[PDB]
Scaffold this active site. Structure first.
Site, PDB file in Angstrom:
ATOM      1  CG  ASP B 334      17.098  -0.169  36.952  1.00 60.53           C
ATOM      2  OD1 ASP B 334      16.884   1.007  37.266  1.00 60.53           O
ATOM      3  OD2 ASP B 334      18.228  -0.661  36.896  1.00 60.53           O
ATOM      4  CE1 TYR B 462      23.454   3.159  36.318  1.00 58.45           C
ATOM      5  CE2 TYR B 462      24.444   1.104  37.067  1.00 58.45           C
ATOM      6  CZ  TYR B 462      23.414   2.030  37.116  1.00 58.45           C
ATOM      7  OH  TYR B 462      22.358   1.832  37.961  1.00 58.45           O
ATOM      8  CG  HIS B 520      14.185   2.068  41.288  1.00 62.51           C
ATOM      9  ND1 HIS B 520      15.108   1.065  41.463  1.00 62.51           N
ATOM     10  CD2 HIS B 520      14.151   2.404  39.978  1.00 62.51           C
ATOM     11  CE1 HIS B 520      15.667   0.881  40.284  1.00 62.51           C
ATOM     12  NE2 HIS B 520      15.112   1.655  39.357  1.00 62.51           N
TER      13      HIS B 520
HETATM   14  O1  LIG Z   1      22.173   5.660  34.568  1.00 63.66           O
HETATM   15  S1  LIG Z   1      21.066   5.978  33.686  1.00 63.66           S
HETATM   16  O2  LIG Z   1      21.236   6.161  32.255  1.00 63.66           O
HETATM   17  N1  LIG Z   1      20.224   7.289  34.388  1.00 63.66           N
HETATM   18  C1  LIG Z   1      19.176   7.952  33.593  1.00 63.66           C
HETATM   19  C2  LIG Z   1      17.841   7.529  34.158  1.00 63.66           C
HETATM   20  C3  LIG Z   1      17.144   8.768  34.660  1.00 63.66           C
HETATM   21  C4  LIG Z   1      18.151   9.889  34.657  1.00 63.66           C
HETATM   22  C5  LIG Z   1      19.326   9.441  33.823  1.00 63.66           C
HETATM   23  C6  LIG Z   1      19.881   4.670  33.845  1.00 63.66           C
HETATM   24  C7  LIG Z   1      19.259   4.186  32.707  1.00 63.66           C
HETATM   25  C8  LIG Z   1      18.344   3.154  32.781  1.00 63.66           C
HETATM   26  C9  LIG Z   1      17.998   2.564  33.982  1.00 63.66           C
HETATM   27  C10 LIG Z   1      18.608   3.071  35.125  1.00 63.66           C
HETATM   28  N2  LIG Z   1      18.485   2.673  36.426  1.00 63.66           N
HETATM   29  C11 LIG Z   1      19.293   3.397  37.153  1.00 63.66           C
HETATM   30  C12 LIG Z   1      19.553   3.206  38.562  1.00 63.66           C
HETATM   31  C13 LIG Z   1      19.102   2.066  39.211  1.00 63.66           C
HETATM   32  C14 LIG Z   1      19.404   1.825  40.534  1.00 63.66           C
HETATM   33  C15 LIG Z   1      20.172   2.742  41.223  1.00 63.66           C
HETATM   34  C16 LIG Z   1      20.517   2.520  42.667  1.00 63.66           C
HETATM   35  F1  LIG Z   1      21.029   1.283  42.927  1.00 63.66           F
HETATM   36  F2  LIG Z   1      21.478   3.353  43.124  1.00 63.66           F
HETATM   37  F3  LIG Z   1      19.457   2.718  43.496  1.00 63.66           F
HETATM   38  C17 LIG Z   1      20.615   3.887  40.589  1.00 63.66           C
HETATM   39  C18 LIG Z   1      20.324   4.107  39.263  1.00 63.66           C
HETATM   40  N3  LIG Z   1      19.930   4.285  36.338  1.00 63.66           N
HETATM   41  C19 LIG Z   1      19.532   4.085  35.046  1.00 63.66           C
END
Ligand SMILES: O=S(=O)(NC1CCCC1)c1cccc2nc(-c3ccc(C(F)(F)F)cc3)[nH]c12
Ligand SMILES: O=S(=O)(NC1CCCC1)c1cccc2nc(-c3ccc(C(F)(F)F)cc3)[nH]c12
Lengths: 543, 543
Positions: B334, B462, B520
């Site tokens: 992740d 984020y 996931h």
């Molecule tokens: O935010 S990103 O850049 N999104 C990108 C990735 C695909 C589309 C845009 C991002 C980038 C890299 C890893 C990421 N892991 C998550 C994530 C993990 C857990 C939960 C939960 F806890 F809610 F389940 C929600 C989101 N997001 C990520």
């Protein structure tokens, strides 16, 4: 007034310089003079090498671009490159040949000890070759000794562009007239000079250091032997393992390779190995410097029986199990040396090799209980009665360590007639002088470590004489046949070299070490000699 | 009613048995039947082997005594021992041939999971051969799975003497009728039987397990595939490194060999690698499972910019420097997978090999700021506003993890229209059901970890979209040329396998892994498959 010293890597902190090897390869390959150095610098600011130094591309992406520059250069010179011509091989050999310029590192260390801010400013690349670990190892050993490391590939700027010098100035928080800049390339020296910095064109190290000593006013050349690198407690990795409910063992960890377990003596700390930890790590070992049970950040249960050799040894085994280590080299000093011989006697499977500083191996006499002995080493009797020695040693912590941690010629404490005198410090001053072995800061580290648990746990190591003898008696028919080293210290009047004389009847393959003009506190008394003996023995008997 | 199970090592928990190899060597050397086994047992209770098993002498001191017994035995049989006859060679090969009896260990594990007290009772020696590490490695892997390990050489007693059985009973805190004793030697089984214990004479493992299943009433044979060994947080070595004033990084460490750095995702823990840590350690690696910045026992500064990729990466480099590691294999999941690609991009010298679970490598678009994007993965927008998502996620910690940590078919949370809904859990129950991946205990470990810092630090990962893009843009001309593995998970609807399709344009030598029916939470969803992919890739691409 100078307050910062800036050093280049290639041709300054590291020798030989890769640029000098390009010239070396061209004379070996009978190539026109400068051909390879000219191919290296082709297109200058707009060229392939500038992109590599700015971190735009990696070393591996650069090899093909250098190949092309070489082919083009050889075409205009109307010469042929050999059949086996390869930039990869030339650069692999060059990078690997490059070693630290020890006298230059020594001077940078001296300037920093005298309150100078020190920095490495280098034009470097992002190394992705399979052999990259060589350079990573060089960078690690070097970077630790400096306040800053500025790499072109990391900042996206290169020498001789003026921005990197302005960047250096901002990083150092210094005016140009406050900085000495040392470089082997004239061109990269000129922008530092323009800003008003003191500059040293490094060819040979001696003349460079003469200029540096003259401008700083600090003796850099012909200085006495420096002490090995020490440990700053707050810069270490601190490890904690629960060995049983209520008993947790603390350790400091440094390095990679075979595991080396360091076991301190009474009344010490992991910190007593401060001069060994960096040296053995650099020698290619994974050092684990223990806080033994009753000390520092390790648990200190009050009960006497918790400090008998059987329990301490079982706990050391559990320590290995929880760290997932089948074996460790066990190196002990004083009471740690005692534990270490017992680990080898009872758990040879878990001990790669065993080494003792000062503490000899003497088999228990099955006919005589050691409690029966005698006022010659009566500090033992004095240490028996619970509470007595705790009160004397805890009264003034600073005095305790200043009185104990003393070199051979520094009027060491008497270990005889202590019960008659009614204490260890009865003929000692209230405010002892500071020993040549320790600083006030190092004494204060011990003081802080002892404020947590005091001396009950440490003294309880002396309170299991009969229990240890009974257990030692079970090993009377065994010999120690695993690799073993016995290090004696000439002027240790408690753990005397003569006491070790018969060890060969029980350890036939025993290897020895000996330290002249060395007292009881071996590690801090003679750190340079201790590190030499240990590393030579580790590389031969422990891989 | 049985509540304890006792197992022998040789011929029970470990195969082949050394006694069986003595018979194997005698038939290979055309020696009279039983000659070597008879020499091994010469003088019975008064003999050399009893002394070795009682810990009176070590293996090396025993070799000459066994040699003499062999010579004497061959003389009365009126035969000749061969020219190259050596007990050392016979025993070295025998000890090394001995491997764990996996189905027997599996059954012992099953019985213990069902609340049985388990123990190893073995007649063993003090091994001081140069090859002792082999047995030490076997003992370590075995002992961890049992409540007690009783070794004859450590207790000074041997089977079949009645005292060791009485000692076993006292250690187990059990009456004889409460114990199942499993042994391959009839003679060593009889004293357990006399006391009233259930006894199993082990020849072949299947019949032995049939008897054990029948008497315990627990299914031991033909059971489904068990999960890999997990981690008990209190049994781990916990490490702490200060990377800068106010920022300290926590990690769990297990094993020896090349360093393997495990980087968890959002909103996780070092504990998310619980099923990997023992497996990779056993595979011959020094595992360092991180608590990433903002999580668990690592520091969680409040400022957003402290969680940009540049800072997190620089801190990971400092982490290596302070541990004295020139390199580590970087394995991330992740957000940890994201960090891991950047470590390889910016510090290839410090990265042995790089592996990502689920998270693909996608180069930044220099023409478009990623802040511009779109309600399809709007949890990103929702996570932007400081304080909002912290309030939802911290309200009920138990609910947060039960709602997040869900398998592919377990009604996973929607990642679309979350801003419109005004939260992640707006269509989720107040009391979610417990997922098949996690126990209430494992959920409660996460709950306790999140009580310290909460979700500000984790969410701040984020909140550096633009900062990360600007830095990522500096690496646009680079390729990843060090060993790399990309593991996709079929049913990851956020980190979709399709998103990884173009990675070969930037990582030409890329090796891949793929996990079918995996969501996931890859590590806990498919731990067995994750461990297989990682170990195979480590042994080929990371040594
Ligand atoms: O935010 S990103 O850049 N999104 C990108 C990735 C695909 C589309 C845009 C991002 C980038 C890299 C890893 C990421 N892991 C998550 C994530 C993990 C857990 C939960 C939960 F806890 F809610 F389940 C929600 C989101 N997001 C990520
Ligand atoms: O107690 S022993 O069994 N004595 C034996 C050793 C020689 C004669 C009898 C013992 C056994 C093993 C190691 C020992 N290290 C010390 C010691 C250390 C520091 C201080 C100081 F802090 F006071 F300096 C005083 C004594 N004593 C030890």
């Amino acid at each position: 007034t100078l307050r910062a010293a800036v050093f280049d890597l290639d041709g300054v902190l590291a020798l030989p310089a890769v640029f000098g090897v390009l010239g070396r390869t061209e004379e070996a390959l009978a190539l026109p003079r400068g051909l390879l150095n000219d191919a290296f610098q082709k297109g200058g600011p707009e060229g392939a090498t500038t992109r590599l130094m700015k971190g735009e591309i990696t070393l591996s992406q650069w090899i093909p671009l250098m190949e092309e520059n070489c082919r083009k250069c050889s075409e205009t010179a109307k010469v042929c490159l050999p059949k086996n011509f390869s930039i990869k091989e030339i650069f692999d050999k060059a990078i690997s040949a490059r070693k630290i310029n020890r006298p230059m590192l020594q001077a940078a260390l001296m300037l920093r000890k005298k309150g100078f801010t020190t920095a490495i400013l280098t034009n470097t690349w992002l190394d992705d070759r399979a052999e990259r670990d060589g350079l990573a190892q060089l960078m690690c050993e070097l970077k630790m000794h400096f306040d800053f490391l500025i790499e072109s590939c990391q900042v996206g700027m290169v020498k001789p562009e003026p921005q990197i010098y302005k960047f250096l100035l901002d990083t150092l928080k210094a005016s140009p007239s406050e900085v000495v800049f040392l470089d082997d390339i004239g061109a990269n020296l000129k922008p530092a000079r323009d800003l008003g910095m003191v500059t040293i064109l490094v060819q040979d190290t001696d003349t460079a250091l003469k200029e540096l000593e003259k401008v700083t006013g600090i003796q850099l050349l012909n200085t006495p032997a420096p002490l090995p690198t020490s440990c700053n407690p707050s810069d270490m990795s601190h490890g904690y393992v629960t060995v049983k409910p209520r008993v947790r063992l603390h350790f400091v960890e440094l390095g990679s390779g075979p595991a080396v377990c360091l076991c301190h003596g009474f009344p010490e700390s992991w910190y007593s190995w401060r001069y060994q930890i960096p040296a053995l790590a650099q020698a290619g070992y994974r050092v684990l410097a223990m806080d033994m049970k009753g000390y520092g950040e390790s648990s200190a249960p009050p009960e006497i029986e918790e400090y008998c050799m059987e329990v301490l040894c079982k706990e050391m085994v559990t320590f290995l199990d929880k760290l997932g280590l089948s074996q460790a080299v066990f190196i002990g000093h004083d009471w740690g040396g005692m534990l270490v011989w017992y680990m080898a006697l009872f758990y040879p499977e878990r001990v790669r090799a065993v080494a003792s500083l000062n503490t000899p191996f003497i088999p228990a006499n099955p006919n005589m209980s050691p409690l029966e002995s005698n006022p010659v080493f009566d500090y033992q009797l004095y240490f028996q009665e619970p509470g007595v020695a705790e009160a004397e040693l805890e009264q003034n912590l600073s005095r305790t360590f200043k009185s104990l941690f003393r070199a051979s010629d520094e009027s060491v404490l008497s270990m005889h007639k202590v019960c008659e005198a009614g204490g260890l410090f009865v003929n000692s001053p209230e405010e002892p002088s500071l020993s040549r072995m320790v600083t006030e800061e190092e004494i204060q580290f011990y003081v802080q470590q002892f404020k947590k648990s005091g001396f009950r746990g440490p003294l309880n190591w002396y309170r299991n004489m009969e229990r240890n003898w009974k257990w030692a008696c079970k090993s009377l028919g065994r010999k120690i046949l695993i690799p073993a080293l016995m290090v004696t210290a000439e002027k240790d009047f408690v753990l005397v070299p003569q006491m070790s004389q018969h060890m060969e009847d029980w350890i036939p393959h025993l290897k020895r070490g000996h330290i002249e003009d060395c007292g009881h506190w071996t590690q801090m008394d003679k750190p340079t000699e201790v590190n030499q003996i240990l590393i030579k023995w580790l590389d031969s008997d422990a891989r």
